[PDB]
């Protein structure tokens, strides 16, 4: 309920979210899940929903801790890799899309999430 303010008023918002979850707090809700075919490429961050049979597609900005908390992004220019795009999240992790994006990395060669879809 106050998870957004909790992270927004922390020196390290990503660490605050992790500590909040470790203390038993409920993950950030209202991540925008999209209706889709589930026959997409399976890539992590795409121009339109690209979920495969094992993923869910969400609106990018709703899954970004910095967009949701209305705070600066850790990028030098201040841009966001999720806003204006769609993020594919494994169905087993769809209960916490914001946490998934904070805890995971996109493979720079295949475009899939490392440890989930990345075959490289």
């Amino acid at each position: 309920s106050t998870v957004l303010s909790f992270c927004a008023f922390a020196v390290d918002p990503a660490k605050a979210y992790k500590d909040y979850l470790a203390s038993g707090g409920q993950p950030i809700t209202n991540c925008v899940k999209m209706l889709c075919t589930h026959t997409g490429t399976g890539q992590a961050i795409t121009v339109t929903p690209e979920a495969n049979m094992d993923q869910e597609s969400f609106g990018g900005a709703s899954c970004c801790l910095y967009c949701r908390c209305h705070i600066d992004h850790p990028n030098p220019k201040g841009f966001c890799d999720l806003k204006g795009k769609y993020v594919q999240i494994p169905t087993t992790c769809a209960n916490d899309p914001v946490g998934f994006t904070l805890r995971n990395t996109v493979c720079t060669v295949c475009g899939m999430w490392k440890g989930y879809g990345c075959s490289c």
Binding site: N30, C31, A94
Partner: protein
């Protein structure tokens, strides 16, 4: 068979009536049993609106311009904008607005009263989900409502391109007589009810292919009474069937011509192209909102 459709459009038989204004016997708020798990009501609603818009003669230019009013939810996210971004061709200019702050996937997000939203550029498609809740007051008097509706009529008259289209949310109490009258300045219009929200008096007033002049004379007070009469006499069973097949969801890339024509050049053959959604009339200048 109606259950498979994304929703129900007001039949022409009901549009041609001259009904007296009565109360609507439908309730808006209700435990929505057809929305799939994890899906927000607005994602299901806008999905079915875009599925219905896919059946219309929408002009789809290469560099399409879309403005979305009332895009923000109480949750601080923009689910309707997320569906519009999914439906529209990649790179379509999508700008959204709302009185209060929210997170959006639109290219531009405007915060503050809609009257404060100003642009010199014309749009190809206007979507509105604005609703009057602060005033609301259903009570007994169901008069034409001003507020955002007055700005919206002016916005369509000054900033909607010829050939352009609109989808504006209305309810039993949130409506405007001048908006219904303006529907007669389009090639075609309807009141569309989404199958997922069929128990509510809500509908989208959809105007297809704006002509910038009256084609029919609509009295707004009367047409709202006609809309209420249809809703009272035609119950619609809630349905989410159309949400289970998204294979043809994206708006077809038509590459609709955009021309800047003078009034003296807009003749019968040009009106005929506008009515078929084969033309958009406006400048192609840099957009500043």
């Amino acid at each position: 068979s109606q259950a498979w459709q994304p929703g129900v459009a007001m039949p022409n038989l009901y549009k041609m009536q001259r009904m007296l204004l009565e109360k609507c016997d439908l309730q808006n708020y209700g435990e929505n049993a057809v929305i799939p798990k994890g899906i927000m009501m607005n994602v299901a609603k806008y999905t079915q609106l875009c599925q219905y818009l896919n059946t219309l003669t929408l002009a789809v230019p290469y560099n399409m311009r879309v403005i979305h009013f009332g895009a923000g939810s109480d949750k601080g996210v923009a689910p309707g904008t997320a569906v519009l971004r999914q439906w529209l061709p990649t790179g379509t200019l999508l700008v959204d607005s709302d009185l209060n702050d929210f997170v959006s996937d639109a290219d531009s997000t405007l915060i503050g009263d809609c009257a404060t939203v100003h642009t010199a550029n014309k749009w190809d498609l206007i979507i509105s989900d604005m609703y009057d809740p602060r005033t609301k007051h259903v009570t007994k008097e169901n008069d034409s409502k001003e507020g955002f509706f007055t700005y919206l009529c002016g916005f369509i008259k000054q900033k909607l391109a010829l050939g352009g289209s609109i989808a504006v949310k209305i309810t039993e109490h949130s409506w405007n007589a001048d908006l219904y009258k303006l529907m007669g300045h389009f090639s075609w219009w309807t009141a569309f009810v989404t199958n997922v929200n069929a128990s509510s008096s809500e509908a989208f007033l959809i105007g297809a292919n704006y002509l910038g002049k009256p084609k029919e004379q609509i009295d707004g007070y009367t047409m709202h009474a006609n809309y209420i009469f249809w809703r009272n006499t035609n119950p619609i069973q809630l349905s989410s069937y159309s949400l289970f097949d998204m294979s043809k969801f994206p708006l077809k890339l038509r590459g609709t011509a955009v021309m800047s024509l003078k009034e003296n050049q807009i003749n019968d053959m040009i009106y005929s192209l506008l009515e078929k959604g084969r033309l958009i009339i406006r400048e192609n200048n840099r957009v500043v909102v």
